[PDB]
Design a protein around this nucleic acid. Sequence first.
RNA 1: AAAAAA
Length: 613
Amino acid sequence: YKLKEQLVQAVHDNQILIVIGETGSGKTTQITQYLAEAGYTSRGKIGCTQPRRVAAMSVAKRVSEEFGCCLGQEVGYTIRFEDCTSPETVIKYMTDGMLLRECLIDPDLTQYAIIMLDEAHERTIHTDVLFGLLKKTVQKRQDMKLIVTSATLDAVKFSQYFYEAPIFTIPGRTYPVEILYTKEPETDYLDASLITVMQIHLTEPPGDILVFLTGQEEIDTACEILYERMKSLGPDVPELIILPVYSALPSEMQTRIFDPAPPGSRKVVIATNIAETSLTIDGIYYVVDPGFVKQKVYNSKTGIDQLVVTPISQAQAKQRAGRAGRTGPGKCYRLYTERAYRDEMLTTNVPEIQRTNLASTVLSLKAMGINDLLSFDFMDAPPMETLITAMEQLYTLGALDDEGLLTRLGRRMAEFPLEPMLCKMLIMSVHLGCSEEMLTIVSMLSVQNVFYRPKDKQALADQKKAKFHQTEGDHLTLLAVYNSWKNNKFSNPWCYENFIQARSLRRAQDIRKQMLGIMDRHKLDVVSCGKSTVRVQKAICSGFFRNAAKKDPQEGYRTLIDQQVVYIHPSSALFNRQPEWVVYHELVLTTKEYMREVTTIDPRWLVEFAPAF
RNA sequence: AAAAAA
């Protein structure tokens, strides 16, 4: 259709068009086929963006199904390191991170004609960066159309930025959500959610419950606990289809959240912020929102940015509530006090760009000739402090000139879609003749669930993981795993025998192919160091010198820069072989401020590789 | 332990 007619006319008339309304099916599904019916596929590709990987491939499957064509043909997608397309692709669904990474290659995005954006979700640095490059390709490509979805409120900001583009309203029925607060604050959200989910299931009418947890480890612990609490009520109680949802989860398991449970069994979808996307699960009436999210927080006092558990903002709590009243009138179970919401919780979430390290961002820009640092019209302004903070970081790495211009190492690191810390040490391993092993170690660091350690066999998993522990350090331990995997002919029963995640190695093997490509393409020689593993140590140190730490004889370690006590993680290949000097990869903050993936170094390197100190 | 993305 009734307002389909209006959209296709306004899309032909206006170059940039903002859109306020529905999400997923109704938005990206409906919209895209209308333009397909208007013959824009003849002029070039339609590039649709999605916040999450799962949704990018889920709308992409939906559309190819509707369109009739095979998936990966006319309708294809692109997620992670997989290009599930063809030259026959005419409708390509991808993540904002993907289009950005493509625009870095072709800043005129000549492959496309129409660029659909799902930005009615959240604003990530990738989105902030993309929005900038697109503003330029709008002036650079008079022919190119650009639809951008925005949240009802958000809409004014997007219009103003995109040359005062029209804000097209898509109508529909909104359903009321009776919000209910915890009488008094809970001791632990995890358990409380399981108290809630149990109650809701047994007492309340039909409707699938939706829980917002922090991470996999927590969702895993929620589901098991929820299952044994369910099974305890015998065959009397009706079935609950406990559904875990987090990005490490296989697609068959991720997509089953969208599946409508039997007529008597109700389902609980225990997700991360994976499910905060226009990822519109049908038949949800209950939301169990504890008001917590795993996100990055940045301190200018020391350039590092790490994941904390900052509570979800009021603006977010309100959309989570909205996740109930979509199929029909819902109920939002806020696991906090009304006092919490109006006081303890922030009004609206701080944009990624301010709460994250901007070195991997400055490098991206200064690389592609954006040395100006003002010209790129920032939709979410980055504070000049953290900008010059990040600028300084690259000088020490050897990526920026004394004046602030580009360097050889800088331009060489710029060719990889990697963190400057990882970049320096992979570009350096070429100069240091340990590139074969550094390609291994970078790809292995990229994947996270490397080792299999179940709760039912905690001890056995440690004894199996122990066979790989290097006297050298955790980085070389990862190398030992991947190298003994190829040794044992990429055997799946070898992984089962050794307690190694065969999927996580298979994933890491692809990134290694994907990186060897950039390597071989830009003439970076790929060479081994064989038994001379000290070559690897030196090269790791070249990139992670900022992450140097020294053994405090009283307790743990002390940072070379902060001088804040940091401790080797309980898992570490060094956790008991702890040495005087080390370089850590990441920093997990839990019980203690644990150093993630540690390797031994000789302090005599914090000058051989970091004279800018 | 990595949230999300590459």
